[PDB]
Design a protein around this ligand. Structure first.
Ligand code: EQ3
Length: 304
């Protein structure tokens, strides 16, 4: 009776920060140069209090040829290439960009941001004024908590263009692994999920899932089956820090158990400087395997 798509409804009182997809949808309506200017503005102002971590060396190497090609272009053509990405135009650059994992896309724009600051890539025109709709989108972004701001910016970047990923880091040494503690939750599957993800131990992590089980990242559709979920762990889930705090455990239909945990997560892009408020919603089968886990970005503290 449980389907993945029906399991999406467990713990319906959980208020997700759906202002994030709402804002992305508004952003996606904008003129391309407005999109690019808006992120430049948001990025400049955010950088006054938050520092982005440098892209990894492997990621920089993978994006290097594309970056070099843009830098060699004349200023008008550099701007056109960036507009192509924002417009999701079909071009060789846009197809290369689309083959990249999120971290490589993010590191590509990190470097273009440095080069625009230095004047070596064509900057946003001086004195540029955003459109009416764009100004309102930027205002909305600047009113969000930092965890929601960086999620808007990430999703905007990942949406550009029209599989290349970083190498997979070896799992953390067993002796140096730390274990989480969750108020009210001693469920071994949940604790093993948190601890193995915190150790980048994706091969152990995936064995917690049913063959047909699914993982639903914030504001995304469920990723279904062990092959696809493992691919997602390896491409996108390295070096996270999960800090679960508290939870609740309840029976579900057919001998299943449903568990909701709240806490914080840190991305390696910002470390301890941005703590995202997160809920995990687990649906476990009678053997304790993960049939479904959703990860939600919460609308505020006071969803924790
Ligand atoms: C795009 C662009 C520019 C550059 C923009 C840049 C450099 C933006 C960079 C933004 C970054 C680095 C954002 C990073 C965001 C990271 C986030 C939101 C990570 C969140 C991860 C989470 C919530 C992980 C949760 C997970 C948990 C807890 C699990 O249990 C399972 C795995 C999963 C991943 C779901 C500039 C150059 C500034 C201007 C130009 O005109 C346009």
């Amino acid at each position: 009776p449980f389907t993945i798509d029906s399991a999406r409804g467990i713990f319906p009182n959980t208020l997700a920060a759906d202002v994030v997809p709402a804002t992305i949808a508004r952003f996606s309506q904008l003129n391309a140069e407005d999109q690019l200017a808006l992120i430049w503005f948001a990025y400049l102002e955010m950088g006054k209090t938050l520092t982005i971590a440098a892209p990894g060396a492997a990621s920089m190497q993978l994006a290097e040829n594309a970056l070099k090609e843009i830098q060699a272009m004349g200023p008008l053509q550099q701007t056109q290439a960036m507009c192509d990405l924002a417009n999701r135009a079909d071009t060789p650059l846009c197809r290369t960009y689309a083959s990249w994992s999120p971290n490589i896309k993010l590191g590509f724009w990190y470097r273009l941001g440095e080069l625009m600051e230095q004047g070596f890539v064509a900057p946003i025109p001086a004195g540029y004024q955003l459109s009416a709709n764009a100004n309102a989108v930027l205002a909305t972004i600047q009113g969000l908590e930092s965890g929601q701001q960086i999620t808007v910016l990430r999703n905007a970047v990942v949406d550009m263009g029209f599989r290349i990923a970083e190498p997979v880091v070896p799992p953390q040494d067993t002796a140096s692994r730390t274990k989480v503690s969750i108020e009210g939750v001693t469920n071994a599957t949940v604790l093993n999920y948190m601890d193995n993800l915190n150790a980048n131990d994706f091969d152990t992590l995936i064995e917690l899932f049913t063959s047909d089980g699914a993982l639903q990242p914030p504001f995304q559709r469920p990723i279904v089956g062990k092959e696809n979920v493992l691919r997602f762990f390896r491409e996108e889930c390295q070096n996270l820090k999960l800090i679960p705090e508290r939870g609740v455990t309840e029976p579900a239909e057919d001998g299943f158990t449903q568990i909701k945990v709240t806490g914080k997560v840190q991305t390696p892009w910002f470390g301890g400087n941005v703590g995202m408020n997160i809920a995990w919603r687990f649906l476990l089968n009678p053997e304790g395997k993960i049939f479904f886990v959703a990860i939600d970005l919460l609308a505020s503290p006071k969803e924790l």
